[model samples]
Target: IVGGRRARPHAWPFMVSLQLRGGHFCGATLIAPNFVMSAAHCVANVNVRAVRVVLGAHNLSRREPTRQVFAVQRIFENGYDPVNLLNDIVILQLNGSATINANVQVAQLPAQGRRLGNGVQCLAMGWGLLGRNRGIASVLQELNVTVVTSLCRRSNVCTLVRGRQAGVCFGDSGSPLVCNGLIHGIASFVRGGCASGLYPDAFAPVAQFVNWIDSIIQ
Candidate 1:
């Protein structure tokens, strides 16, 4: 299986590295210009001072002294299923908005009426583990995943695609699954283990949450 393609240059300028407990745990994404979307479980506390966001990062391990890092001002999670896996989305607002430029930009959200088809190609990029049960990769990596329709039905789950690349695994949570140049889903969870057939991967459908997201941004 070949890995997914790399993120397009400046495709996710809003992407940020979320640091908690002074860098004890880390996650990354591009939810908004002034905010970052990640798993709710990742942020168990509401204290904004405890979390931080790093923007314009291509590599996390190698420090670029001049990079812009901001403190989180607010954290937002859905009321329903506060602990459920399905509603595992959260937004981290930056203390101040970063200037958007060649290196900072927002990804396009999926259209409200867009529908995914089986065998449709999707891309997943992360600084997470390279393989199952493995340590997180130091550098960003991408994998090509196809939608899996049968497993999705079995899981009673609905994603952007009907079949093929139906799921994401550990370390992939909150990663965007881009199809046709638009974000259709977020890497959420897998059924059993990473890269397993019986366990289908899952992602949060972005189309269903557009209104909620728009309201937050506005």
Candidate 2:
């Protein structure tokens, strides 16, 4: 996260750190006991064995009693387009189900065909870069962003940090954009670097893939 603040511990219980070889690389959300949602680019071309989903986590650096780790069993991606990042969502089936508790729970998806109007305020959280050393933050960071506009592709949404030119950074991809208590977006890309707010941050709109998400988990 860039120009973001530390998130309250376990406040976003559906949040998860998507790890590669035990290192945080992307952010994801638990949508079901055995289903995890993320940006396709994060898992594309990666080995399933190296993929780990850490749930019920606040600080990645500390040994928190609430944390739980699960290995990925199978991976599925929409028809991802690297050039334009279209259909950039992916789902990971966990090797085992996550034990839901106060610190761990499934995210609520937006109602079918639901769309946020332009200028709707939303909360975005992740463990992405802090911009000082281009290093990822150990603690989750969050910021409020506004819906800038809808994209040409219906599957994507664009948002801008309320006052700054910075928002989600590297490693923040796959993080959820929560609006009205439902997940409507998944972090996908930024126009320039993490700090450059030249273009509004782009995300894979969850509503566009609701059918696909349901089919995969079933």
lDDT of 2 by residue, 75-164 (tens): 787688977899888898998999999999999997667877889999989999998586889999998989888442566888887556
lDDT of 1 at 185: 68
Cα error, candidate 2, residue 29 (Å):
0.5
Q: Estimate the TM-score of every prediction.
A: 0.79, 0.94
- Quote the lDDT for 142 in model 2: 93
Tell me how many clashing residue pairs each candidate has: 15, 0
Top candidate, metric lDDT:
2
Candidate 1 off by > 4 Å: 1-12, 21-28, 45-48, 80-83, 153-168
Candidate 1 residue-wise lDDT at 161: 23
lDDT (Cα, 0-100) at 103 in candidate 2? 97
Give per-residue CA lDDT, model 1, range 1-218, as digits (tens). 11334455445555555655534244556666677777665665545577767767656677755256778777777752544566667777878877666666677787654567677777666655655355555555566666656657421223332333323445556666677777776666665555554555676666666678778987
